[PDB]
Amino acid sequence: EKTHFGGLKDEDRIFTNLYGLHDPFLKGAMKRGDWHRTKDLVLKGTDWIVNEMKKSGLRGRGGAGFPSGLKWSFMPKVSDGRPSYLVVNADESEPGTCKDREIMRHDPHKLLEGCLIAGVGMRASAAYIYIRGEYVNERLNLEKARREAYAAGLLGKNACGSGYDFEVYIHFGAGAYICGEETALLESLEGKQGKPRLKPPFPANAGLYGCPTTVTNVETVAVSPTILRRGPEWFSSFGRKNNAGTKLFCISGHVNKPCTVEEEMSIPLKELIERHCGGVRGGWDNLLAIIPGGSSVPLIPKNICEDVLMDFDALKAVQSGLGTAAVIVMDKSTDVVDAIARLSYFYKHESCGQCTPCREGTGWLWMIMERMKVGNAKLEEIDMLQEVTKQIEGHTICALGDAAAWPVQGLIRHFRPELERRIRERAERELLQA
Amino acid sequence: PYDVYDQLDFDVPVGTRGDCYDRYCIRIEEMRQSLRIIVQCLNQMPSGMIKADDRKLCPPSRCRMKLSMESLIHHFELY
Amino acid sequence: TALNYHLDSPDNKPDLPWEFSEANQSKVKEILSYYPSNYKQSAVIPLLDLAQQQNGGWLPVSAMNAVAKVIEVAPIRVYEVATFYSMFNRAKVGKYHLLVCGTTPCMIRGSRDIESALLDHLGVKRGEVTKDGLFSVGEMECMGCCVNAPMITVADYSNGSEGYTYNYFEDVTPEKVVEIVEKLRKGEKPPH
Amino acid sequence: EEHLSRKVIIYSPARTATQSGSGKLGKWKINFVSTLKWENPLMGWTSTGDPYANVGDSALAFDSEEAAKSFAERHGWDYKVKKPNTPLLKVKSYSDNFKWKGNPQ
Amino acid sequence: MDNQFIFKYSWETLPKKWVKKMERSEHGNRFDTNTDYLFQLLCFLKLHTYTRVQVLIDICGVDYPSRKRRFEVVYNLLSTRYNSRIRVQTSADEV
Amino acid sequence: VGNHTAKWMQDRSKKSPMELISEVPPIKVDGRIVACEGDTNPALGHPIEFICLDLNEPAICKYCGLRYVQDHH
Amino acid sequence: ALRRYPTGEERCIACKLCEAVCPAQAITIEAEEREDGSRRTTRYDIDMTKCIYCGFCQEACPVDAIVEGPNFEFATETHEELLYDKEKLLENGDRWETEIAENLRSESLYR
Amino acid sequence: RNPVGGARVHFSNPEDAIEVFVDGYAVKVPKGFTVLQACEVAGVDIPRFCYHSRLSIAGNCRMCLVEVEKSPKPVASCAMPALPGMKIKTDTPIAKKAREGVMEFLLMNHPLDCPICDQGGECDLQDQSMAFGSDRGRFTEMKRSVVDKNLGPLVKTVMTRCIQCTRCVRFASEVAGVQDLGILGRGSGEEIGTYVEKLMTSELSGNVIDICPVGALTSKPFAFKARNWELKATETIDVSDAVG
């Protein structure tokens, strides 16, 4: 309700095959409700689909949370000769996230019908599904579902008997985290190195092959048909205002029972962990720090986690983000400084190397963080560490550079005494030993 | 005044006749006043840098020039 | 020991002939059919993956030159792609590439307890193939969240492109990893 | 007298190609074309007997084309003026990197 | 007698046609004058009670080849009475 | 003995500096990178130079001519 | 004097900083790639009759190659003996190396 | 104000022109000019490394950052198109701080080679460090190092100096028409090279020496022979063919 959020029922769940108990193929998908009367939805026209998306309040599920309907409306109404492309981002290489993998594993037909619904809502003639390279088994599942849809007439020429021709193809990456970035995905799909582009141009004006293009997450695309069929007002009824709908959640780390669950948006973080995942290993008092969604947002401490809600606006106000809704939980036994230094290694390793502050700064951050892990640093280096993060942030081509500075900035902001102590203990050991 | 001459005590001898003998006595008295100043400089000599810190006008130390890119660039430019 | 350049060797040099097999020409044609005919370069990644599967799990420089010919680009543009992405092996690996020693999410649950036992049973160091040419150990790249598994990866290049599998194994222990190696040696696909 | 009948070139030196910075242009020089130098047969040092060996590049300078011309004509030198080349700024777009190739022919 | 007082008092008392340029700066108070007035300006400054510029420190020339009057002649002067310095400059050519 | 040295060295009793630095054996390093300062006291040497040892052939310091190699591989 | 490394290699790498800073223009340098690829002078002349013995060259050198040593007793009978070439300078370095090195150790705490 | 370098600006039509402000001053530029080109018309010299007027825009060095009103982030002027009413600031504390931070990152792994480097004395990196980033260096860790590459008898290579601007790669593809140079690898370990051992055969290959802003690509026959301050410059024409 309007007061409290959580406790989503089975009847409001969109992904009705999340645990893989039923058949994910065409017979089972039609049994669950997929490809049901799809012809009439597309005969309502592009303008109606975009309007329903706008009214549903759906926001981008890829981390940025941009409103989905406004983003589809960016596509041109009249073609200037160039075709229009829809690109589905199934390249989730962010540590701790598997929501898109589970969608491609147990509801591929939701993705395929979402691909067609989105394509009509974008006036796009073809769609490309960029899957992660190591999702080999998932891709083979998707290709089988795609072959099923083509034979049944649901995809291809005269899709579902409506006269709208729509091709769906499948592409896969080769193991690069940066290729999940929307412009880097476009470059990788063009057969080049996965290096992000500058903006402008924006993809809706010059994207794939220089043609108008929209890149959207698997989750965002896979929920459009259920929103269309059940209506935007049902979807907007969940969550707070501007944070509408339902979210796929995955909670890992120091919890009694980790699991991936579908839950109402803006659910309290504490309620989420205690209701679906038992609780912090050792009780809620044992909690030390939580990473709300994905390793690309800053951590929050125990006092902030007590009443922060799992939505875009709530986590923004405490200097964090919803991200991919990949909840990583750390109890008091974790070495937080080691955990952050381990993330700093990941961003140095995953940097595409194109632009100077990220290419050179990510390595510098990792080197300092490895030194601070054992206290082999001066107390004034913590301030210097803070300033190097500020030199990276806002000065890079893409948002990986910001995502590299945020975990370090959060550590200093919330656990500076721990770093200061490690420096003190090392200095005390240095004085007595020699 | 310039440098630290305002923090130092010394007399300015002047003549009364303006001939060669006054100028001889003044130069003698000026060496006694120079001796007086040197003593005060010796006693008031503080610790610190002997070169202006700005890094556009003063050479870096040899160790800095051989260890830091910025210092080497400045040394190359300065010389 | 991955390097951003190539040094000529008897089994890896540009004058060695290399082309897609006749049973692979059909796959090559259908891969190219997904993209506009004047945008063939979009096929570089799936074609490099298919070349890797045909050639036993690694890409000699001749294989890269062969893909560059199909997509009609200069070979340097293919070298850029093969060196940028980490799934491409530019040095020889065994018939079964074992990928271990994960990243951040699995080290918290003690992931660095599987590698040393693997090299000790296999009798090689990381990066070099065994004498019989069956097994090599490589750096795994991780997905997911590492909740219920110090995990390992197995790439099966022992049956070319028509028997290639890329599977992840859960709950792997210094014992269980060996059980995988022995079933892999005997030909049985280990359960995952 | 003797050094007042030499012919000079008045020109504005262009930008060096080894640097992208434009901070040395706008100056106007008087080139005395001092090309009479040889090697001293003791140490291999470069010798000259021409007094205007470097004054045209080291000391004399002018802020305008007219100033250099006026100075040359007052001294009686015969001058030729070489007008400097300038770049033409053209419309450049980053979006051009991703221009559509058109339909396959 | 600071440079603030000299600049203001010279503006009020000097005949206007003598000085064409007045620069007040921490580098030095400077009075640019035409050549036909240089002698009279220097006699005023020497004899006037409120200036008493009794010492001529030196005279130097500067060459400006890009100028119609290429030579600048600079008179550095000193008042021991008021502990102040003044710079008086004028331009000249070759003839 | 070479042409570069013969421009200035007119005495053949001692070896040229190019000969002398060639006789110093390459230094084995455990790792792929080594920093050379040209002296035990860094202030008395040359500006610090980081040298990569990925190539089989020994790597030369561009300031002092010392050669380095990877010890194991 | 011109100095060597303890291996016998020359310290000078022909940066030409000393030539540029020299107030008397007493230094002349020619250089080219050596047969082993090293950046070395083929000519290094100091005109001892133009030099003002200021020490600016020793300050400018980044590798401690050129130094003003402690010898002051080198009067000659001819002007040409005071035109020092590269080999004479390196001979001076060999003769005075023990004293020069000790002096540099002494003065390394001030520069 | 005189455009930078005295550069000429051509207008197809006076109607096809827009007004932008560069440090308060008002300039008129053709439609389609970038922020950097507007700054040149204003006579303001923006520091740059990856940008070359005769090559496609790359926007990777991040040295051309300026402040744009109502823009939340510093703006790469080389790539950003100019818009009517745009207020461009180049000397603000945000722009100055961005330049110092980027110059710090550029020199982090750069080798202490100015004495042995032929670019010394005519080096954009040297001049911009003296001007824009007047940072006392605080990087104390180990620098990365790169092995040199063989590109033939004309282009000598010292790749530790490379700042990965990709001017050489873009020149090879766009101007020379011979695609031999690429950027291999990923991250701080990316290296400019040909991957396989091959020499630069294009008849315009030597031009990569001029466009390389650092001493990574230099003329092998000119190596170590002279410093730029001791060379007399003469402007003349070439007689090797009938082009002049």
Ligand SMILES: Cc1cc2nc3c(=O)[nH]c(=O)nc-3n(C[C@H](O)[C@H](O)[C@H](O)COP(=O)(O)O)c2cc1C
């Ligand atoms: C380093 C990086 C990695 C990213 N990875 C993904 C990803 O794996 N999946 C995804 O949907 N978006 C990813 N994004 C966000 C995309 O740039 C883009 O905003 C998103 O795919 C749009 O999807 P949406 O609007 O439907 O949420 C990534 C962004 C960055 C900077």
Ligand code: SF4
């Ligand atoms: S910020 Fe990092 S990942 Fe993004 S373009 Fe720059 S170097 Fe590449």
Ligand code: SF4
């Ligand atoms: S001492 Fe050295 S720097 Fe000074 S004038 Fe003599 S040669 Fe030149």
Ligand code: SF4
């Ligand atoms: S003596 Fe020193 S300063 Fe002079 S050229 Fe040699 S290395 Fe450079």
Ligand code: SF4
């Ligand atoms: S390119 Fe050469 S001259 Fe320029 S900063 Fe680097 S080492 Fe010094």
Ligand code: SF4
């Ligand atoms: S070699 Fe030179 S031009 Fe090429 S990327 Fe490196 S710095 Fe740029």
Ligand code: FES
């Ligand atoms: S052990 Fe966790 S991904 Fe490899």
Ligand code: FES
């Ligand atoms: S000059 Fe604009 S980013 Fe390199």
Ligand SMILES: [Zn+2]
């Ligand atoms: Zn050395």
